[PDB]
């Protein structure tokens, strides 16, 4: 059930104003948080993401994600951000230089290679460089904002990289 | 695992051109089809949807969904369309009169009432009327193309309907 979310390790969301309260609860695991954000149990809002305090074992169910306005994202090795994929835009806007979706299969069905891995191919596209371009796992991303759109390094030794078949919002 | 798809009962996809082949396989259940479209097993394309022939127990893995161009959708009581949610636009374009996402919680956390149900409230918004507006299950839809955007009939007897908190593609 935690599979239906997008984890951002050691990350927490912060916003700005006083008008915001954060529904929390002493939970047993991060799964409990998730199986309640999904089924929107006792919420007076629409849960789009939640943060799990690993040290206190507490959840903080939010009505927005790291992508909302005014929404910043703090650091902490005891926190874990989890965002409902239902609320992370799945289509591209242009060359999709701001794509944050979990797609990780190239236009022709080849699984992607982790950005934090140098096999099968070696590259310069590290998470430590393109910070903010979200080069997590093996997601389809576009660091340089190239024309092709989201792409990734193929796990097929015969293919360096390749574009990903991700829909335009103003499609075809 | 079939939960990570959007079923459209007794429906099949048809396209137009000759240049298209359809990967199929004699499968045991519709789950088998799904657990292979998801993990893109032996595909030379990106599976966005699949159709299960209940009578032949065969899958047809497609590289597009009912939303692609040239793509039509036939009828048959032995067929079942299943579309990867990853490829069904989750954001709104305007008043979102063409929204086909699986969201079904109102802006304030109230679960939605099935369009094919007359409880708690009675209405005229039937699937038989607004055909093409996809008034399936209890999804957030906008039949009349109103200003508010996607909405639905609340399951709370105290609330007739209410808007759903669904993101704009050119958000905020």
Curated annotation (Swiss-Prot), chains A, B:
Range covered out of full length: 39 to 210 of 728
SS bond list: 33-59, 37-47, 91-169, 112-152, 140-164
Residue intervals of the Kringle domain: 91-169
Protein name: Hepatocyte growth factor alpha chain
Every PAN domain range: 1-86
Domain of life the protein comes from: Eukaryota
